[PDB]
Amino acid sequence: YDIQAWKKQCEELLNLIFQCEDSEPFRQPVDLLEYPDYRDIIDTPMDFATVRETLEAGNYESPMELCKDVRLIFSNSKAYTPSKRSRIYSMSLRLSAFFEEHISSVLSDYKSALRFHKR
Numbered sequence: 001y002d003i004q005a006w007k008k009q010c011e012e013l014l015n016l017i018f019q020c021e022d023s024e025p026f027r028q029p030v031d032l033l034e035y036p037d038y039r040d041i042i043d044t045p046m047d048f049a050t051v052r053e054t055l056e057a058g059n060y061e062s063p064m065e066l067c068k069d070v071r072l073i074f075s076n077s078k079a080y081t082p083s084k085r086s087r088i089y090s091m092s093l094r095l096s097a098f099f100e101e102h103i104s105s106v107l108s109d110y111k112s113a114l115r116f117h118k119r
Contacts, residue, residue: 003117026048
């Protein structure tokens with residue numbers, strides 16, 4: 001019932017995501033010189049360094065907010081991909097499955113802790 005425990009759990013999950021080779025295309029903002037039409041398709045860029053920095057700044061109130069930004073990394077890859085078989089998109093799908101598998105307990109524990117606080 002620890003309402004604050006999510007933050008360190010998210011830090012540890014981001015550390016695992018940065019060790020995963022599948023995260024390399026997503027660790028820093030998409031390079032606009034490499035992909036010059038990126039912002040014609042993607043309204044809200046997001047990357048794992050921005051997520052980590054937002055967490056470390058104390059600018060997430062809940063793990064739901066962090067989860068929304070990570071999911072945006074993956075939806076941006078899906079929107080920008082020219083093919084559902086492309087390398088970078090393919091990496092995004094594996095990383096998404098790994099993230100969802102690990103975040104589910106973080107979210108459940110947080111929401112249970114808040115319900116207990118409010119009982």
